[PDB]
């Protein structure tokens, strides 16, 4: 997260860290045994870390649970990044104040809606600096047209842009799969962008409201 602030210990209870020997992606806890992340975050041997703040030291509120199943959207396209969504089943259910799930949306959010984006990703636009603690960022959802203007011929109906055209505030490497929460509902998944915090190049997110049916049914039949 470039240009954000320190969230504060466990103030984003649904934020999870995907660990493969080190943090490589974020994710959101939707129920005690399921996590939603990005399809490009698929890796074998994933360990989900819940109740995390400082990802480098064991503080006591953590729960490390291995993934038993990782389901990438059947129509995920690694080239176009369309349908960049994945569900991860926890090997055992999590013990739900520091660890809580986030609600799926009933409807899609409109341009201008302020949302909270979080993660342990890079905090420098030009450079490298990974934080120990969870970072937060309030960013508004942008219109389909401006998003399509920023990325000609790359935006699908399943993606939305959020952030600031000026640059300086954005999600970055290490934030993928993390939540974009608006009005208490999970509206997006950190996905891609041209660099980070550049500017006229806002971050692109997977539009979660288009997958609610698929998510609920997939959770239920697995």
């Amino acid at each position: 997260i470039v240009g954000g602030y320190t969230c504060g210990a466990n103030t984003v209870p649904y934020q999870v860290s995907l660990n493969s020997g080190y943090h490589f992606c974020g994710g959101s806890l939707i129920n005690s045994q399921w996590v939603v992340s990005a399809a490009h975050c698929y890796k074998s041997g994933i360990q989900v870390r819940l109740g995390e703040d400082n990802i480098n030291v064991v503080e006591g509120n953590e729960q490390f649970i291995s993934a038993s199943k990782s389901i990438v959207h059947p129509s995920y396209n690694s080239n176009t990044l369309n349908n960049d969504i994945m569900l991860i089943k926890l090997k055992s259910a999590a013990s739900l104040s520091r660890v809580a799930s986030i609600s799926l949306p009933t409807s899609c959010a409109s341009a201008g809606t302020q949302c909270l984006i979080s993660g342990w990703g890079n905090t420098k636009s030009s450079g490298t600096s990974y934080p120990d603690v969870l970072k937060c960022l309030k960013a508004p959802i942008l219109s389909d047209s401006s998003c399509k203007s920023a990325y000609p011929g790359q935006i699908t109906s399943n993606m939305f842009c959020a952030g600031y055209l000026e640059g300086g505030k954005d999600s970055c490497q290490g934030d993928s799969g993390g939540p974009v929460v608006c009005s208490g509902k999970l509206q997006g998944i950190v996905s891609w962008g041209s660099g980070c915090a550049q500017k006229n190049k806002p971050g692109v997110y997977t539009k979660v409201c288009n997958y609610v049916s698929w998510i609920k049914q997939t959770i239920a039949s697995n």
Binding site: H23, F24, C25, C41, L81, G121, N122, G174, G177, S191
Partner: protein, 56 residues
Amino acid sequence: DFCLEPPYTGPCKARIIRYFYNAKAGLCQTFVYGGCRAKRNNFKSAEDCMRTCGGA
């Protein structure tokens, strides 16, 4: 020769550690891969890297 190309992080925002052949150093080094659109000088291990590019 793809072994001579600089490492490519790509547009995705994951922080996945991969290997690339660094011709200047004469060895495979680690770099952060974003998770999508990898080019060929991107390996999952130093051994794969040395096997494919070592000595280029």
